[PDB]
Structures are given as structure tokens and as C-alpha cells.
Design a protein around this ligand. Structure first.
Ligand code: CA
Ligand code: CU
Length: 98
């Protein structure tokens, strides 16, 4: 399993790390950190074949420090995702599943 912080400790509107590599079957824990609210929306155009973007996204906002969203990914490939309220500020990331 791995952790991605939503917002840097400094307040920067970024996923930390921006590009994460995990093995198939690991759970990714998105932890609310700074600059919230944030959400985690996977991009339909940038996920492996057969994966449902809606099913793995967290649309509803994370509002409190430490609030966590966990999701297990199994299909190998790349998964592009973003935070809706901060997509314009460049809050986008990627998960590479091996
Ligand atoms: Ca980084
Ligand atoms: Cu955000």
C-alpha cells in the first residue's frame, strides 16, 4: 500500500507524490493534507481497458485534515486522475500499476 497526500504541507495544490508507482493489488491511501477541499476523480481517457472511472473515483469532497480515501487497483497500466476544484491550478496526478 502507498500514501498520496492531497496538498503539500506548504499549502501547494498538488498530489504528493505527483506520480506514484505501485504493484497490482496495492491499496492507495489518499490523505487530506492542505488546501482542501479536494476530491479524487480518475480520468476516463487515461485508465486501463476494463476499468470503470466512476467506480474508483471519490467525487464527494474530503474536508478535514487526515480524512482518507482508499482504493485498491489491480489492472496494470497508468491511471490519470485530478482534483476537480483544483484541476485549473494543476492538481493532477498519475498512478502507474505494475
Ligand atoms: Ca513529486
Ligand atoms: Cu484539490
Amino acid at each position: 500500500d502507498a500514501t498520496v497526500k492531497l496538498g503539500a504541507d506548504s499549502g501547494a495544490l498538488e498530489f504528493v507524490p505527483k506520480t506514484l508507482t505501485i504493484k497490482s493489488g496495492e491499496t492507495v491511501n489518499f490523505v487530506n493534507n492542505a488546501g482542501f477541499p479536494h476530491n479524487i476523480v480518475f480520468d476516463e481517457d487515461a485508465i486501463p481497458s476494463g476499468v470503470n472511472a466512476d467506480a474508483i473515483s471519490r467525487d464527494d469532497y474530503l474536508n478535514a485534515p487526515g480524512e482518507t480515501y482508499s482504493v485498491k487497483l489491480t489492472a496494470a497500466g497508468e491511471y490519470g486522475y485530478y482534483c476537480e476544484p483544483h484541476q485549473g491550478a494543476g492538481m493532477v496526478g498519475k498512478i502507474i500499476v505494475q
